[PDB]
Amino acid sequence: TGYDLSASTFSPDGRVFQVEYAMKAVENSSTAIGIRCKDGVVFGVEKLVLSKLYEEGSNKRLFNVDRHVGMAVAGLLADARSLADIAREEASNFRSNFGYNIPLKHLADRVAMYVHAYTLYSAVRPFGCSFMLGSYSVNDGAQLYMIDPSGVSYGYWGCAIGKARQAAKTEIEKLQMKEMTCRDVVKEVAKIIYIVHDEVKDKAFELELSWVGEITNGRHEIVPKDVREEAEKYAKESLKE
Amino acid sequence: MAERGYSFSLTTFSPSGKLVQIEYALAAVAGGAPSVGIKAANGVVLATEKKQKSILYDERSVHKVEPITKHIGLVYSGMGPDYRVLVHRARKLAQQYYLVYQEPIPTAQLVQRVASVMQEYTQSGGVRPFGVSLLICGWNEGRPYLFQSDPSGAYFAWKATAMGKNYVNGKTFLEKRYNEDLELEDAIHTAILTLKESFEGQMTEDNIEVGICNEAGFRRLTPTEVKDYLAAI
Amino acid sequence: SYDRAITVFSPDGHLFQVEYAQEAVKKGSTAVGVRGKDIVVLGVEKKSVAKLQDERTVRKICALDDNVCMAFAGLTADARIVINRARVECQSHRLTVEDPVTVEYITRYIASLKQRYTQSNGRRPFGISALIVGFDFDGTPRLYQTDPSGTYHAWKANAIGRGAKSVREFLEKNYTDEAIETDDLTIKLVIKALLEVVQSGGKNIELAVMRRDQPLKILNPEEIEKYVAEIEKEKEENEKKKQ
Amino acid sequence: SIMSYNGGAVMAMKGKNCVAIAADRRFGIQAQMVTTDFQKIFPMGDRLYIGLAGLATDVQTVAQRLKFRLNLYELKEGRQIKPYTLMSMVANLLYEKRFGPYYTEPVIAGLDPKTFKPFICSLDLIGCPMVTDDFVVSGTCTEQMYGMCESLWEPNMDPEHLFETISQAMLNAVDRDAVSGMGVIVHIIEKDKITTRTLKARMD
Amino acid sequence: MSRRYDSRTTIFSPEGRLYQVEYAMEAIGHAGTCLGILANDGVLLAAERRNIHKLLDEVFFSEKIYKLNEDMACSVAGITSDANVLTNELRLIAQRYLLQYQEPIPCEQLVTALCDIKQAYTQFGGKRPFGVSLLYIGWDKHYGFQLYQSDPSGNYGGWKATCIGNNSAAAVSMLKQDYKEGEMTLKSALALAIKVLNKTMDVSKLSAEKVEIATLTRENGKTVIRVLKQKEVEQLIKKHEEEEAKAEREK
Amino acid sequence: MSRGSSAGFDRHITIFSPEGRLYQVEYAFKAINQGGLTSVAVRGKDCAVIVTQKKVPDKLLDSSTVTHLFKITENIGCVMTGMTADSRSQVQRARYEAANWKYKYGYEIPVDMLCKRIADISQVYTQNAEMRPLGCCMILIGIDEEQGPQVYKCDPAGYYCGFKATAAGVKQTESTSFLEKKVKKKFDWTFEQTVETAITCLSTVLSIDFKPSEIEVGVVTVENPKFRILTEAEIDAHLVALAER
Amino acid sequence: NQYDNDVTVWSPQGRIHQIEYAMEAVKQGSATVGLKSKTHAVLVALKRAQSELAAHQKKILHVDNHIGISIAGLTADARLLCNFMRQECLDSRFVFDRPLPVSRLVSLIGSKTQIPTQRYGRRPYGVGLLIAGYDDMGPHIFQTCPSANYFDCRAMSIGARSQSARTYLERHMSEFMECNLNELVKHGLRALRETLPAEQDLTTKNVSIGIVGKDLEFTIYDDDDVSPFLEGLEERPQ
Amino acid sequence: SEYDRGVNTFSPEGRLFQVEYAIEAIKLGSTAIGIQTSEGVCLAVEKRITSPLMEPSSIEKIVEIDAHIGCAMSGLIADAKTLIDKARVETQNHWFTYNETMTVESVTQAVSNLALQFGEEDADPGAMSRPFGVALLFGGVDEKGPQLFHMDPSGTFVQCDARAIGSASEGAQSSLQEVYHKSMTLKEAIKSSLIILKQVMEEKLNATNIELATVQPGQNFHMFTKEELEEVIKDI
């Protein structure tokens, strides 16, 4: 009875409904997945093409937030872009102050606390996006973190966010990703994305792919065109039985 | 995130001319643990009950009778964390007074400054009034002082008073037991008896906290001294 | 730091806070200004006489400068704020410009202050209307009216406050060049206009007079009573001789 | 140099149950005398006085600001200020201007309210208090005043001996200073009365 | 957010009224009675003591009467802690004027400064108004002895005799009937105050511990402000009782 | 006024109800239970132990990052209960407060002082209307040189206290009654006995036999004041010892 | 309802209603079309006259020598945003002595317009923009929205009745890339004409054309410079 | 009732509520007419005097912004005061910086930039709390010739050949549409303005009920004296 209007108000059950409504905004966006293998992290996004008038790569949901750190988002894209700017600022300030690349766990904690700061006040609105941060280094290994609108940050071996995240998580569970390399994970990621897409509900989609690992010398980058085409062909073949 | 608080008052006048938020803070005070103050001829006693809700609580960890200076003591009835806020503010105000005048703050002056802070919270933007009543004791110019400060910011000077649960009956008991010329030991006995009137269950040296102010200053009674006094009763 | 919008537009195009400030004005005691040839006269009703009140402390007519004075209707404390601001403005104008203000200048300043309070965050409009009279350096008598909205106009004669509609009707039926030919006739016109709404027949009237080059003058009760007796004598003469 | 711009001399002295405070009366600018009745000793209570030497503008400013604060104190607390409390208040006022100091060196002479024990003190321009039991001096001829007071002061003087001692000290000290003098005013504070006198002095 | 929890303290009502000011005036009407009477040789305040309880410690100076500077004093009705705020502001204003001009502040100027503070709370800032009405008594070299009354709205006015607080309207009727302008002395003014307090405090009989009386007079070019002792008020009440008894015997 | 009375906005902002209650603070206390977990802290004669329930529903979640045990300094540990992001913000604040105390005063902050500081910070949320209180509870353990092991708990109301033993979360009432029974029959608690008491309290109120991956244990001892989290091997050794008895 | 007044209030469905209402503000405006070839970017704006005696409202604005915009929605918000974009372009030319790349400018716009969607007492910008630019990456058409989302487009139309224009652009998008400047402008004009009422036709009074290109700084054609582009247009197919 | 929504809330139709309400407020203003010809711009406003005791010369609904620019206002005149002061300051600033006269369009643009600078949060103290309730007609002569611009509280400004604002702006606008042709002379413009004002005014139209001003190439802003007003009105 009027308990769901501000993030500074608790419901009688102990819930903050504004944060839950932001989470609902995330649950309506399209699916992004991240998979952490033994030598890297691979991100795959199902980017829905709403208009054929759009260019390729418009409204991309994969970001480079640092040389070694990539970002996969779901939810309100403008919120996600502002959060990517926040993450870039955090990484750059860390390098300026402490003189080396920010560890992924520290960047995830900093951005998650920034996100949580928007769940306490009536003067602001919780972010309507969740995202994954992926990184690789020789010293720290491969790391994959996920942050939701409430500000909770967790490490994962595989993660899915968006409309079909439960089916995507089920598909991810069937993978022995701990011993796999980035090369075969990219195919597996493309297959999972093609599986969870609904052609009736959504007409067309581009498959955005990126990775970071020893394959890229610890640099997050878009997966090259050859590997992407091979992965798409393999996923399309797996769809047919 | 936005650090701007509300700038409008949360305590406003009702059509009948009352500030209902202050009356509700007083209701919170009236639901608090009983507190008693008695001003004897040579000192003041402040006695409160601290009956923990379990034996798992460490009695010695938290205190309800607090020193403000070497000569001023505090006790409260109401909401404990509000009390901690006011204790910190009172200590800072006493220190600022000492820094300006290089003498310990008179009890009445400190009471006035603390009451001013409480009034500020009755009028300023985006806050509720404090939900505590303070009993303040002090020794100044060879003289004992006992004051009560309410959540509105009004303060009164008392010879003996009670706050918290059953404080009307405590006041009746005090006014039919209190007399002038009383000594500090007899005032301690009377304060413990006033607590005993509203106490539920057995009163032990750990169930209650007692502070005394005399010429030597203000101090909390150790549980051994309280046990001696309880044995005398 | 309180930054609420208090005066906002209503769906019909109205500023309700300004209308409510005008309703606050309509509850004030009546004030009448008449602009004559050589004189400007202000007159204020006293809604009640407490018989124990120091009169000097509750005057509704005050001097903004040597050549400018004003009466008001509405909220007394808002009027005090506005009057003090106008006095500061008059002194600063005497400083930066080596001449006194025209009546229209200080009227413009007061009106713009009121308008600012109708369109700024965290404050309500002033609940007063003002009648400002005076003389310019040319010796021209000037009478102006400001309202809570911030609009101001010039008048030959005007009335504000409660019962101002009947007083304005009377002034429209009565104000004439012949009716302001002498100072006494102008004063009698002001008192007659006030008598259209006041009770007890002239004990509840405070009257002030400004003449060219002369400071503000306040009529003591003896002069007001003498003028009232003159007015009643003229009434009796007209009634008997014409009927 | 700045402290000597207007000249001036103030002195306080302790008696058995009494205090004395004396000041020169000249107001002048460098070598030129302007007036001969400039007030340097201000009452801060029934039995409490403060004398100010230094820049005349800062003498007046500090006296007025101290009166501000003292009036507020005595309204908030329904009592008269004690001399030690007044000294602390003056020191706080002076130290608030630690880097922009007032150019005055106050001297405080009084009796304890309700006790009537003599109190004298002096403060430097940034408010470092110095309580003594015999005498305090301030101004442009402190060396001469020290000679006179160290020679002439005795413990437990009755008010008449105290008046003679402080008078001779002030007169002979300011006779030997170019920019002080043109008359001396002495206040003797006892518990039951205050005596104000002007001394016959050289006017050159 | 702010908008839905904002009480809107400083806005007009549809009738042109300020509701918070009116409710503060209701609060004033609740509080203890204060009375002010001006005579030819002084002025007096007489306030009903609402802190009456046997366990209350004796008050230091006075419960409701505050000295403001060397020449002025005031009495308060309404919210007590708001009155503490206001009396501190008044003392500060008087000392600021003294610092600026090296003369005591005239009474009306002090009242006007405080009333400007009150009005500012009525117009902007979104805060609730002060729930205090004040009576001021003073002397200055311009107008001699003066009595003033100020409201939470910031309105003020000067009076020969006035009353605020509980039963103030009946007290004002008594004052209108009984006050004699230009002929009051402090003795007759004190007698009138005792009679008015007798009528206004209808439930509780006049005893010296239920009332506080302060007089402001001039002696040797100094202003003397004194709260009467308990025995003096007892004598005044005894004299009033004798007057009433003899007036009954005549009738 | 009447029981459970409400007037105005007392159910939405931290203002007093007619009975003098703050409903938003009570709702924050319910927000603690929204997390669904339970933690227990027990004080020994030479040690303090915190044992929290660890739940990882899915294998996709990196378990090493799912912790409610944190170290505030080298010598102070904490277990958080309730909303996870609120808990982590409070942990960050506690670490900052401890570091600043060491910097300003030149010695490590005592546990009671840190608990009191956090409690003051949260009382501020109970008194200001524009922000909600945090929906989390903090339990701190440490070793004071003068007084031995220390267990302190602070809650959303701003209330804090020292405990001989305490619990937080869903089943904290049952846990408190169990600990009351254990502390009434007072016997000298060694390190092993303290750990077993905490673990058996959690296992008996949750009505499940534990596994080394299902719980998290942190300890401070007088011999080794540094806060340390037991590995799964040490926890399994303790669990075996508890199961055989 | 209780969820549709503040931009900081999430609805129970995961939507923000004030943002959607600002989208409606954009949809109320008159149509405008933007398209690009390999070498040119063209904005064609259908201007509306309030009265018969009023000039048609300006729809195409200069931002920089290589960037221009066409606006739909609240004109004053569009002027705010245009001033911001001009200041960014001048900052880039001052600091780096190079023209600001178009996609970086669009990112700055998105960042600036996202902020008021999260802060209490703020509102979204009620303006949609078509941004035509040319830089090292060639020609660019961008679309910015009140939601602060932006799109890189082959072609786009916004404003009232823009769906018909979008259908025409869908049909001839394959042709656009190899068109010469006149043919590209004519494609844009036909798309804009598809949004017109039956009685109304494209005239030199209600058509404005902005062109940017490889060797062509951004140029606006309003009344008489439009006639060479209007000449040669076949009658509406119907 | 009026504090439920903030001042910067969009309606479901994409309009700011406060701007729409200010637009509605302008329909309560007196009628003003601007006509732009090749020989100059004419502006005419109904004064709408309420009482015989009011001095009509104290009503200023037409003001000089600069020697070459005049402004007619409708709606809430007190609101128009600050906008006009801003326009005067901007013209003088432009003269100070560039040693030339500001064009009518740039002055109108500068004034229109203020229309939507209102809000409650994220504002300096004393910032505008609501939109202005005025509609303005700027008539000027610049290098582009004589121009007439209309500005409304939404902040939209448009060039106009002829326009009416105020209470009777619809019927007056329809009359303007039949009367106005491009080659109209300034005398014909003035006569047609006065004819339409006479048609729509509730009172009879004399030399004291109206204000009329013209700006011409080579002649400064000129407010018609009452003798000139009677010269024009004598044959209507």
Author numbering:
A (entry chain G): 6 to 246
B (entry chain B): 1 to 233
C (entry chain D): 2 to 244
D (entry chain J): 2 to 205
E (entry chain C): 1 to 251
F (entry chain A): 1 to 245
G (entry chain F): 4 to 241
H (entry chain E): 6 to 241
What does the paper say about this structure?
Each of the two identical outer rings contains seven unique α-type subunits, whereas each of the two identical inner rings contains seven unique β-type subunits, resulting in an α1-7/β1-7/β1-7/α1-7 cylindrical architecture. The β1, β2, and β5 subunits of each inner ring harbor N-terminal threonine residues that line the central interior chamber of the cylinder and function as catalytic nucleophiles for peptide bond hydrolysis with, respectively, different substrate specificities. Substrate access to these structurally sequestered catalytic sites occurs via gated pores in the center of the α-subunit rings.
We determined the cryo-EM structure of a mammalian PI31–20S proteasome complex after incubating recombinant human PI31 (hPI31) with the purified latent bovine 20S proteasome featuring a predominately closed-gate conformation. We also examined the difference map between the PI31-bound and PI31-free EM maps and observed hPI31 densities in the 20S antechambers as well as in the catalytic chambers. These findings indicate that the C-terminal regions of PI31 in the catalytic chamber are threaded from the antechambers.
